[PDB]
Amino acid sequence: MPAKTLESKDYCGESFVSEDRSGQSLESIRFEDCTFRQCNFTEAELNRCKFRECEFVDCNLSLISIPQTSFMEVRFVDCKMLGVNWTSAQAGALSFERCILNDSLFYGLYLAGVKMVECRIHDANFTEADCEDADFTQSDLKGSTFHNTKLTGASFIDAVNYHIDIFHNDIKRARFSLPEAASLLNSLDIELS
Amino acid sequence: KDYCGESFVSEDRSGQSLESIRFEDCTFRQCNFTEAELNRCKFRECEFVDCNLSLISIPQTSFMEVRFVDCKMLGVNWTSAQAGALSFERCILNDSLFYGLYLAGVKMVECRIHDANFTEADCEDADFTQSDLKGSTFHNTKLTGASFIDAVNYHIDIFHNDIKRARFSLPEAASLLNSLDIELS
């Protein structure tokens, strides 16, 4: 059953529940303090939209296209978000909680402080990204690409499956866990015990 | 002044200068060379067992196929040395200088090696098995394919020392991650 038409280019305090927006083009809409429950945005285009203090819960955002869209103070909770190109977007004080970010593109992205806690993150690409102080507490990073990724001060406590060549990624003051941290040496072709 | 195929036993040359002497195929047993000086001497296929070579001075001197076993060799300055296929087994090498020295394949096995300087040395395929490297300086040291199996108290900054294909034992090998400035749990 069709969703309310989004006539405005400004929304505020508004709640959006169980709406199917797949395939929709939203053009230059600004949302502030809006909540999104059980919404579907599969393959929507959020073109030049702005999101400030907003929250997404139980929403599917897979293959969403976010060209020149900003998220500032946005929280994503139990969201599916595969294959998203973030490369053109602006992120700031982003939080992801138990999201699935498989295959996402973060090349070059400024992500200082990002929270990606308890997330499935396979084959996501973080090349040239700024991830200072990023918090990957307990995420699965299997097959994700770290390369000239600034990782200074980031947390990989209880994270798993992270391949980080330490010659091409700054990890000063990064927090790690044992035994998982051992993978940091793989960068050296060293034989162990 | 040339010597081939001799065994020298309990000779004392402490604090003496020896000049342009060539040894080939010679054994030294319980010989004292503390503080001796070996100007321009030469050693080919020679063995020292239980000999004291502490503070020996070896200006412009050469060591090819020389085994040291159970020898005190403290504070020796090897910076000058010419050296090939050197082995040290169960020796004390504390405070020695191996500055910039070519040491491919050297064996320093079961040795005490406190406060030695390996800065700029090439120690490719070096064998440090069972040695105590406490306080020794590895800086710009080629450690490619070197073995630290069962070695202890080695501090190696993996950013300023090449360890491609080197071998380590857990748990000592964890000290490697300190080259990194990280917090562990």
From TrEMBL, chain A:
The keyword Acyltransferase belongs to this UniProt entry's keyword annotation: yes
* Gene3D superfamilies linked to this entry: E3 ubiquitin-protein ligase SopA (2.160.20.80)
Q: Which InterPro entries match?
A: 5peptide_repeat (IPR001646), PA_immunity-related (IPR052949)
Residues of the signal sequence?
none
Q: Does the keyword Transferase apply?
A: yes
The source's domain of life comes to: Bacteria
**Entry's SUPFAM superfamilies?**
Pentapeptide repeat-like
Keywords carried by this UniProt record: Acyltransferase, Transferase
Which GO terms label this protein's molecular function in UniProt?
A: acyltransferase activity
User: Could you tell me what this protein is called?
Assistant: McbG-like protein
- Species this protein is from: Xanthomonas albilineans
Q: Which gene encodes it?
A: albXIX
From TrEMBL, chain B:
Q: Gene3D superfamilies attached here?
A: E3 ubiquitin-protein ligase SopA (2.160.20.80)
Q: What is this protein called?
A: McbG-like protein
Keyword Amino-acid biosynthesis recorded = no
Q: Which organism is it from?
A: Xanthomonas albilineans
Is Disulfide bond among this UniProt entry's keywords?
no
Q: Name one Pfam family in it.
A: Pentapeptide
What highest taxon heads this organism's lineage?
A: Bacteria
Keywords tagged on the record: Acyltransferase, Transferase
